[PDB]
Amino acid sequence: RAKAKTRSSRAGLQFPVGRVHRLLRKGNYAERVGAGAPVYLAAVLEYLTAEILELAGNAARDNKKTRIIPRHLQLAVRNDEELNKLLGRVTIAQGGVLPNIQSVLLPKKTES
Amino acid sequence: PNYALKFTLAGHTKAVSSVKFSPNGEWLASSSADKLIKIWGAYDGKFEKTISGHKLGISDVAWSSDSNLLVSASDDKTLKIWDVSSGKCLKTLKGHSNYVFCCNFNPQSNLIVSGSFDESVRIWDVKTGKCLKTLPAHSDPVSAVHFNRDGSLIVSSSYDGLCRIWDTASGQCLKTLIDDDNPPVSFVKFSPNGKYILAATLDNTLKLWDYSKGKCLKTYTGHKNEKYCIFANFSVTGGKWIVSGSEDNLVYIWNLQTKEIVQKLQGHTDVVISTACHPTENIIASAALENDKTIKLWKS
Amino acid sequence: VLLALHDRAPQLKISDDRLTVVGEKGYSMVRASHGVRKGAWYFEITVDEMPPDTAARLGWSQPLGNLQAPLGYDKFSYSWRSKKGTKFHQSIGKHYSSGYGQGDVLGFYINLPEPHSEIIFYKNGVNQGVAYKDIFEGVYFPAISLYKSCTVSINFGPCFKYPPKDLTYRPMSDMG
Amino acid sequence: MQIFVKTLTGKTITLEVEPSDTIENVKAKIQDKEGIPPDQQRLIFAGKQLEDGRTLSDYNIQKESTLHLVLRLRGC
Amino acid sequence: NLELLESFGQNYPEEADGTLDCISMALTCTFNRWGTLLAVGCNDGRIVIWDFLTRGIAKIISAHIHPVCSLCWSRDGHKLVSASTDNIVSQWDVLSGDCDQRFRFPSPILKVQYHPRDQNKVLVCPMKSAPVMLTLSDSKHVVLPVDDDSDLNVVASFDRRGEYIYTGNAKGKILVLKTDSQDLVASFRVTTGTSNTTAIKSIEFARKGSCFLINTADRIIRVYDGREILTCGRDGEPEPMQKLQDLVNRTPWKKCCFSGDGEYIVAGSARQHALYIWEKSIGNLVKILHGTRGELLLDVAWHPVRPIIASISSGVVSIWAQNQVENWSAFAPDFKELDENVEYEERESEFDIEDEEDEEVDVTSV
Amino acid sequence: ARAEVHLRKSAFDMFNFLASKHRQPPELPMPMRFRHLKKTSKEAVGVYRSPIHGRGLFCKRNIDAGEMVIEYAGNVIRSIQTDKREKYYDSKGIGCYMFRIDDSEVVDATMHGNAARFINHSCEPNCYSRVINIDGQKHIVIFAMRKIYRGEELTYDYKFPIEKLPCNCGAKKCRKFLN
Ligand SMILES: Nc1ncnc2c1ncn2[C@@H]1O[C@H](CSCC[C@H](N)C(=O)O)[C@@H](O)[C@H]1O
């Protein structure tokens, strides 16, 4: 009968905690589920999403585009060092690669 | 303005380099460059002994809060520990590469500051004896460094107008008071309230700089100081007396309001280069350059 | 007959009407190629809005000046300050006369009868002070160091708002 | 019943109320005349807490008395 | 005392900054009134004092053979009081280090404290029996009467002003006593959990006001205001200003103290050696700290006027302050190190414009 | 030594930065790299005591031939204020450091700037610059020429038309002039 403070705003987050608690009861991951785990896990997922979307937005401005197309995501992951180690064996669709040419495949000049 | 001449203290073959009192106000060492420091008193010229054992010429001696620790800032580019009640040197603080001009002690008896001409101010431990930190300070040989009221600030001048304020613990500079003209700011010192810092320049203009804003609009003129690092002081037992030395054989004392000549006390025979105020009496040490060699004490 | 194409600061807000401009971030002394050599010619400067810290220097300058340089440097140009009425010309500081307000109908008149000059500050057709005398060789362009973002508007037509009292000039709609 | 509520800040405030009112009436009156957030209207009856879920007549205080409010954050 | 023009966005401690690798086997720590010294007890019964501004070791005093596990400073900063398993009411000088009082009285002591204004009244907290207040010259000892006598674990202290004596048993019943006449003016049992009571480990106070802390044993630090106890009086039922706990690791605490301004609360683990810092007002964690990952924490201090924090682990006393960043314009204030294209046109008094002291201040004042 | 009359005191202007330990070693599209530049220009370079002339800009990170090094940024002036600021800086006894971008404006470095003032001159350079567009506001970006190792004091050529002041830097195959 009291105020329906949802567990998102009662925590101070943006990811839902009801959907996370449903997908931890109904995944057959354990018998009993605590009441700190879905909150903590919602926070972790939010922080990783914020971490990649910051760099995505920076690259999206810096190529002079409004939206974000996945080429920016490929550049934003593979330019960073720790996110590339996280996304180790991952192929983003429509991704492309970093521009990389070796050191000996391009000519050099000596005379005059 | 009734400080009359009373005594005469001599006995040094080179120039009497500096005369600074003990901070308790009971002693006054005659550090002269002739490798002789006669341990004089402070009330009549009370000779105790002559402490020597140096290597080259003496430039400056410092004083600590116990009035026992003395350090030799001799021309041997080192600093040696000289306790009064020892008669026995303990350590020698090697590490400079040029001559040592000025040195001081903290107000709580456990720091040593040094000065070297090659633009690197070194910080020294007292008891365990180690070069603590090194400061790439100036463009010039070191003129004057000074601890504040307790040991948090270090003011520093130069030969081209760089009144720099330094931190004790972090060991980086904090504030640089600069004038567009460059009179060589020979001698600087604090004030007991921690709000004012004195300066001495080679243009016949003596200023007590404010600490925060850094200005002085009541400035002194009309005196004689254009070639040397004449020491200036503060008399503590009268009123607002501003003590300094002279070049024309005089003892300069003034009041804050005056900005003129009110009192030029005669008696010496050379450029008065080193004075100190006895911190518990109306006694002012006074010794001039090489053509005097006769330290003359004063009394109201 | 519009504002200048060649003789303008290119960063100005010369809009599609080419009569009203918003001031830029410097002493943007915009000139105009519709300037006088000799004769009897006068227009108005229908200034409308002038925000604070948007000064304006009024005078007549010669075509060999700089677009970014403020008015009143040498014999090319004669300047004057809004606040306190302090003209500055040939590196001289002289607190001279009374200033102006905000968004009045300005515009000065100069006359060269065929060597001698008529240099008077005209604020709504009122004598406000004689600035200088005996101008030298050259064409004379309207140069105003628009200081910051202000609303000024040059007037061209014969429907003059504050014409000078009993002063004769050919109208400025007969040159372009 | 004109109660006095002098807090620990010299902030005396008066409400001429009925002896048979609830806590919500006092919350509405203080929130009207001062805008004080009603999660801090804790009152004290001889040391013990006056709980904010009952009526005024459940404690039988002498009429037109003086109480004391505590500046409290409850829902932050 | 320090620089006033220094505050270029001052901070709250982040770094490790370097420690005292001089003498190990530390046991407890406490600062003086201003935050200029730090007494530290050894393992064999000695005192280590470290001065802060010079960053120098001040004085080493060898007290006794029993390990020193309780310390306090006087108001002037001249009388150290301490007690240990040596059973002795001690009192020490800071210029000399003298055995001024020596009274081996049994049930060895767990905490001492001065009255915060008069240094004549000192606190004594026995091994079992009720806490004792003493004088300096004569042996006038005041044991506070306890209705329980069953815990044999009673904690008590004086607050910021020394107005009253807050006492606490190991059953969680508080008996407020007046500081001289022992007036039982207020009493409350702590509302622990649903119903079941808990023990009380320690109680400390502030430097500004009457907000204070309760360190229970159900892993819940509680924050009350002493004026609420005064407003209650007898048979009080206080509910706290702010409750504190960390249920992720379920960590019982070892030591707490407040900030200098009474704004921030530090509290330390008994398990992980990881310090936490809270806001008093809005009520959340702001920062976790760490250290040597497998050591056992003993005692945490705080510096009042300046954000410096002292820890104790494996006899090593850490000092954590910002690893502060130095830059230009202190060597040359006429030049300031910018970053990008800064425009300079806002002043209008350019292009060749030419226009048309008396304060007597003392020099040897305070 | 105080009775000695050492007068090395004041023969130059007021400024210093000397006596530092100036011996470290003996040895993509455009705006993303502009972000990279604003990131790493602090950790890349360093100003220390040169043996060439006073001070100079060293190098610490091993630079590949082509990357950005630093942005030479300061106050922004136009073409009028040059002679006025030069007369003021000559009146106070201050060296004047300026750099023209293009046919529009000049970036100052005297009263406000960065750690990029302090590159000396040579005629065998290893740095240059171009013109870019970070949203209309153009900039002054230090590229590179060859693989620069650690400890080298950095240099670049000034593109002077050959037009007084002699060569007080001493390069190897220099024309004994800046112009
Ligand atoms: N090798 C050199 N010796 C002296 N001046 C030089 C020089 N090369 C260039 N210059 C001139 O001097 C300026 C170099 S900036 C000098 C570095 C730094 N300001 C310092 O004081 O050490 C430039 O304006 C340039 O015009």
Ligand SMILES: [Zn+2]
């Ligand atoms: Zn050259």
